[PDB]
Design a protein around this motif. Sequence first.
Motif, short mmCIF file in Angstrom:
data_model
loop_
_atom_site.label_atom_id
_atom_site.label_comp_id
_atom_site.label_asym_id
_atom_site.label_seq_id
_atom_site.Cartn_x
_atom_site.Cartn_y
_atom_site.Cartn_z
N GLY A 1 0.19 7.77 -5.89
CA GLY A 1 -0.85 8.76 -5.73
C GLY A 1 -2.17 8.44 -6.40
O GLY A 1 -3.02 9.32 -6.50
N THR A 2 -2.35 7.21 -6.86
CA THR A 2 -3.60 6.78 -7.47
C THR A 2 -4.14 5.58 -6.70
O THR A 2 -3.54 5.13 -5.72
CB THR A 2 -3.42 6.44 -8.96
OG1 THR A 2 -2.74 5.19 -9.08
CG2 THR A 2 -2.61 7.52 -9.66
N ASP A 3 -5.28 5.06 -7.16
CA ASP A 3 -5.86 3.88 -6.53
C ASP A 3 -4.88 2.71 -6.58
O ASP A 3 -4.42 2.22 -5.55
CB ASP A 3 -7.18 3.53 -7.20
CG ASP A 3 -8.03 2.58 -6.37
OD1 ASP A 3 -7.47 1.89 -5.49
OD2 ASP A 3 -9.26 2.53 -6.59
N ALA B 1 -4.26 7.70 2.43
CA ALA B 1 -3.54 7.76 1.16
C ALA B 1 -3.56 9.16 0.55
O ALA B 1 -4.14 9.36 -0.52
CB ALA B 1 -4.11 6.76 0.16
N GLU B 2 -2.93 10.12 1.21
CA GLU B 2 -2.73 11.45 0.64
C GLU B 2 -1.30 11.95 0.81
O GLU B 2 -0.99 13.05 0.34
CB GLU B 2 -3.70 12.46 1.26
CG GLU B 2 -5.16 12.23 0.92
CD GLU B 2 -5.82 11.20 1.80
OE1 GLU B 2 -5.15 10.70 2.73
OE2 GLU B 2 -7.00 10.87 1.57
N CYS C 1 0.80 -1.22 0.00
CA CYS C 1 0.00 0.00 0.00
C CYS C 1 0.83 1.27 0.00
O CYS C 1 0.32 2.32 -0.42
CB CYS C 1 -0.95 0.00 1.20
SG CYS C 1 -1.73 1.55 1.58
N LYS C 2 2.10 1.23 0.41
CA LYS C 2 3.00 2.36 0.19
C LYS C 2 3.13 2.67 -1.29
O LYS C 2 3.36 3.83 -1.67
CB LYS C 2 4.38 2.06 0.77
CG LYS C 2 4.45 2.04 2.28
CD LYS C 2 5.48 1.04 2.74
CE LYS C 2 6.90 1.50 2.45
NZ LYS C 2 7.46 2.28 3.58
N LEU C 3 3.00 1.65 -2.15
CA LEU C 3 3.08 1.88 -3.59
C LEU C 3 1.95 2.78 -4.06
O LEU C 3 2.16 3.68 -4.88
CB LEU C 3 3.04 0.54 -4.32
CG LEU C 3 3.98 -0.55 -3.80
CD1 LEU C 3 3.75 -1.85 -4.54
CD2 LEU C 3 5.43 -0.11 -3.92
#
Lengths: 81, 56, 205, 145
Positions: free
Chosen positions: C15-17, C33-34, C8-10
């Motif tokens: 910066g996208t889903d 995730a911002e 999830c760091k990816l």
Amino acid sequence: MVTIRLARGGSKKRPFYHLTVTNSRNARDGRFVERIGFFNPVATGGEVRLSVDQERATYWLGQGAQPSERVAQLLKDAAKA
Amino acid sequence: LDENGKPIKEAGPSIPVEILGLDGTPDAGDEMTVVADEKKAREVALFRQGKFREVK
Amino acid sequence: ARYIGPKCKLSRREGTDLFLKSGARALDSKCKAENVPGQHGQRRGRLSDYGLQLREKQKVRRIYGVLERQFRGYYQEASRRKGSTGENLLQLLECRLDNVVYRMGFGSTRSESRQLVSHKAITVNGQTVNIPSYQVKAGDVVAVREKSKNQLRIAQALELCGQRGRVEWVEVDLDKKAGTFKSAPARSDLSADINENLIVELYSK
Amino acid sequence: HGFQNPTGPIVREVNIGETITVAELAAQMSVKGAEVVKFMFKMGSPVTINQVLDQETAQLVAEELGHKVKLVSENALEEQLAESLKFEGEAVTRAPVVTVMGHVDHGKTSLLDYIRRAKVAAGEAGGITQHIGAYHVETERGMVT
RNA sequence: GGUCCAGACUCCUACGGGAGGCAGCAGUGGGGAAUAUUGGACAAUGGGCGAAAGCCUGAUCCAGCCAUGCCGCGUGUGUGAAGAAGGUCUUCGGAUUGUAAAGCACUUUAAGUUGGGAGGAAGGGCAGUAAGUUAAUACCUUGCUGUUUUGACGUUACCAACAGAAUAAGCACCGGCUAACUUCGUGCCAGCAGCCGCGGUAAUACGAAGGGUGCAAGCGUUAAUCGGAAUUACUGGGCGUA
RNA sequence: GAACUGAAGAGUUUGAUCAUGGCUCAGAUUGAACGCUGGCGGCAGGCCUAACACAUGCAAGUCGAGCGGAUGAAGGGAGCU
Ligand SMILES: Nc1nc2c(ncn2[C@@H]2O[C@H](COP(=O)(O)OP(=O)(O)CP(=O)(O)O)[C@@H](O)[C@H]2O)c(=O)[nH]1
Ligand SMILES: [Mg+2]
Ligand SMILES: [Mg+2]
Ligand SMILES: [Mg+2]
Ligand SMILES: [Mg+2]
Ligand SMILES: [Mg+2]
Ligand SMILES: [Mg+2]
Ligand SMILES: [Mg+2]
Ligand SMILES: [Mg+2]
Ligand SMILES: [Mg+2]
Ligand SMILES: [Mg+2]
Ligand SMILES: [Mg+2]
Ligand SMILES: [Mg+2]
Ligand SMILES: [Mg+2]
Ligand SMILES: [Mg+2]
Ligand SMILES: [Mg+2]
Ligand SMILES: [Mg+2]
Ligand SMILES: [Mg+2]
Ligand SMILES: [Mg+2]
Ligand SMILES: [Mg+2]
Ligand SMILES: [Mg+2]
Ligand SMILES: [Mg+2]
Ligand SMILES: [Mg+2]
Ligand SMILES: [Mg+2]
Ligand SMILES: [Mg+2]
Ligand SMILES: [Mg+2]
Ligand SMILES: [Mg+2]
Ligand SMILES: [Mg+2]
Ligand SMILES: [Mg+2]
Ligand SMILES: [Mg+2]
């Protein structure tokens, strides 16, 4: 003399053969005069097991070329079909 | 080989022989063992060689 | 090799889903995730053209989960082929066996479809394939081995793929878990956010 | 298969070599370093954070605080090689080895040369032995090295 | 891997007297930064002889060693907020490592064990029958039929069963070129460096630590060729003052 | 029906600027070597230096249906045992 024999290609445990007309005192995979087909010991699927040129084979046999044992057997099998 | 040449094939429990096939010249007092596992022997020898260079 | 670690760091760095979890619960309510991962997360840091191209390539690679050398091979094959390598790369990426198994609802994510394929549970033309790179051709019938048809994984994967959108290029036979690959999905069948021009620009340098 | 709140303490699998620092031991124990040093002040001679501590006391203090302790070998190849190489049965007698020692010219080469009938002392640079010699001979009674 | 002569160099010797040529396959010393096994079989394709069995074959077919290269696959998958404990930074509010871990539940590829199991095989011996050759149901040659016989690789490729998450991640970099930053030590020292250049008391450039970025069973450095270099300009440059 | 489809620049001379011009960098390749690290398989490759010197094995033999000779089976027997 001039012979017709099998030149080995392909890879490890996967042999392919070219039916070649060669001066007898050449390397098995060295210089040749003419190739007159091929033989596939594995084939399967869409691959053909063996194919020969009838015209060239008869012409070279008429000029005094001695085929090997395998070449004799395979050529007579091809002539059978 | 045994003492006076004439190569032999086996060596019993207390017979001095001359072995031929090592990679380098060992030194007297070192002990030899039959490993019967090529990879284990090679890796252990590499480890020992590294330790020898370090201690030197 | 394979990237095994926090998946999830990816998404935060790209910066996208960039779907990597099952999508069951959410994405926002798991990682905030911002911000970019790490201590310096609040900084924005506008980056350069090479950075944009690199980010685009990394986003595609992390979406499909392939490493750099295989991706270079894919690019070379797409360039060799006729007709606009830009979408040729996507055509070729969208035909991998793990991706196809994922699109058919047999696995929740790409990693789980890779788990299924590598562990000898998928047959392509009635015979077992376990290479997660096998380029499936149009008209193949991806199915599940009978001894592997009672795994729950497939049950949750199917019931959750029931609501993510209609792929409309594979027909899944839900009752006995058999699929069909009609054809490769054209560029208009994928999301219009990937800028493959950036990828082609990056490799043409 | 949701979240179940843990109840008891936290247990880890601490790994210890030949020696370890107190800081590293505390790090593998998920406890503050100053605590561990404090725990020494309540049990025998205290220590410091950076002092090199041994393996026996490391295992003792790790087990005292309820942790699973598994150690490692510094040279594990040798123990692995030695363990799966020495296992046999059966026993037979062997010919004896014997060494001959003495002062310089007291005649230890001539004795062996008579026992073997080899007359090697005729050669030899300087009439002295400078190499260790190993022979296997069939004497009047039995084989001897 | 024959002869003769001469030569250099090694060796034998009983001192009268002879022998040798690995730039064939293994192997050794030496030189070097650096390059492997005294392996197996003629089963297959070839070569020599034979009439034919057959003999020979370090050619060849295979095994051994070495991340040297190319390719492929593993080192698990889903859920999981007390956003645990520890580490690091802090404006002391908190943030970050981080769904990452633990917990819960799944799967067994490769590796391990057990059991099945092709294809590389054409042929050869024997026996019978039918045609052609003659002069002849002889010998012999050729079709076919029956029986017997052949594999180094090899515990083959491949397939099925069992056990458990169990057996398996490192390397370089983070001032600009060029993706990725802060604290702590040191103080023109110790050191870094491809080019600009850093270091003289708050160093994003030295050395660590947290965090991050590239690759990944590899990652960096060194050496070398072309490119970018239209910087030998044919394509395609210039010469008043560079 | 195909046998192609193809071309990027940046840093550094000055207080600043344009030009000229050299140096350096970003790519692709090795029969590579070294440092750290290291699970598996398939296919290949492996003295580039001393055409330096070589211990020891093997690498070219076959034909008795070309020819003498000597090795002389099983057997048929003959005698004595
Ligand atoms: N008279 C006599 N002389 C002897 C006897 N043994 C040895 N020697 C003499 O002694 C001298 C040396 O003997 P040697 O056997 O060489 O002694 P060593 O101890 O072997 C020499 P090193 O200690 O260096 O090996 C010889 O010349 C030999 O003749 C003995 O029993 N009697
Ligand atoms: Mg790879
Ligand atoms: Mg003596
Ligand atoms: Mg003296
Ligand atoms: Mg020779
Ligand atoms: Mg040689
Ligand atoms: Mg020579
Ligand atoms: Mg040397
Ligand atoms: Mg080397
Ligand atoms: Mg042969
Ligand atoms: Mg014979
Ligand atoms: Mg021989
Ligand atoms: Mg041999
Ligand atoms: Mg390998
Ligand atoms: Mg290396
Ligand atoms: Mg904390
Ligand atoms: Mg067979
Ligand atoms: Mg930057
Ligand atoms: Mg400072
Ligand atoms: Mg720097
Ligand atoms: Mg630094
Ligand atoms: Mg260079
Ligand atoms: Mg040019
Ligand atoms: Mg250049
Ligand atoms: Mg011009
Ligand atoms: Mg000019
Ligand atoms: Mg002038
Ligand atoms: Mg002037
Ligand atoms: Mg200036
Ligand atoms: Mg050479």
